[PDB]
């Protein structure tokens, strides 16, 4: 549709990009949100562990990495909070999902349950658990 | 060469998912069961919020109070002898 505020470009519409983005955990519609959130949190915590231990205030002392690891965990907690409130102000208890109903081709498909109170709650819980697990794994691998 | 249909408005207004996928879950059933059973207590929202707030506050307070002077220069305190003021004030 030429009258929609979007353009078709090789980057935005390519088989490789489409496949890679559709295989990301944030776009798997059929899977329940908990398993996606667990993976997202694991990856985010494992990434976040590094910079705190590499550029922290105590980075030159012997405690450094341990302290940095703790800081990373704290950040995850804050992020989890930033998720929870976002659910409370967005999705009500009884309203259905607000995800798009039809695909690009035009076929009718089941809307994602991530945009729901229970779905978002599961996503946040999985994200918190995965973030804590990833931070712990990164610390153990780096300093053992 | 038409772009406006009154019968349905999802196509007319452009309500699509560009990168959505409806494939079945690739995760192993055993790992999925383990994660589902172990991550259950954090599913509730109000309980999660209250637990996060209380645990963060308690942990931060405990770490701040229990910390020694090696990590924190403020807890170590001054070491050099004091100095006098401009007009001899103490």
């Amino acid at each position: 549709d030429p009258f929609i505020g979007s353009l078709e470009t090789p980057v935005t519409s390519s088989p490789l990009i489409a496949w890679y983005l559709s295989n990301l955990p944030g776009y798997r519609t059929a899977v329940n949100p908990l398993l996606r959130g667990v993976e997202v949190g694991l990856a985010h915590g494992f990434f976040l562990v590094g910079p705190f231990v590499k550029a922290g205030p105590l980075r030159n002392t012997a405690y450094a990495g341990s302290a940095g690891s703790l800081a990373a965990a704290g950040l995850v907690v804050i992020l989890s909070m930033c998720l929870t409130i976002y659910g409370i102000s967005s999705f009500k208890e009884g309203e259905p999902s607000i995800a798009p109903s039809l695909t690009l081709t035009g076929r009718k498909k089941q809307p994602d349950q991530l945009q729901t109170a229970d779905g978002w709650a599961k996503f946040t819980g999985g994200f918190f658990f995965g973030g804590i697990s990833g931070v712990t794994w990164a610390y153990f691998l780096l300093y053992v | 060469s038409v772009y406006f249909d009154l019968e349905d408005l999802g196509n007319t207004t452009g309500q699509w998912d560009v990168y959505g996928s409806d494939a079945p879950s690739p995760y192993n059933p055993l790992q999925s069961k383990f994660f589902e059973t172990f991550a259950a207590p954090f599913t509730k929202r109000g309980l999660l919020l209250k637990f996060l707030i209380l645990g963060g506050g308690s942990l931060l307070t405990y770490v701040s109070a229990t910390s020694t002077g090696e990590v924190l220069p403020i807890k170590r305190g001054p070491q050099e002898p004091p100095k006098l003021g401009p007009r001899g004030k103490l």
Binding site: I85 | I53, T61, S64, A65
Partner: peptide, 30 residues
């Protein structure tokens, strides 16, 4: 003693977060 080491982090960090969360939730409520 050591009251400042317990009270400064509380007022500086925890209370602003609690107040911000409460105010955001109250504002966004319909």
């Amino acid at each position: 003693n050591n009251l400042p080491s317990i009270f400064v982090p509380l007022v500086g960090l925890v209370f602003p977060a609690i107040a911000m969360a409460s105010l955001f939730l109250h504002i966004q409520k319909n």
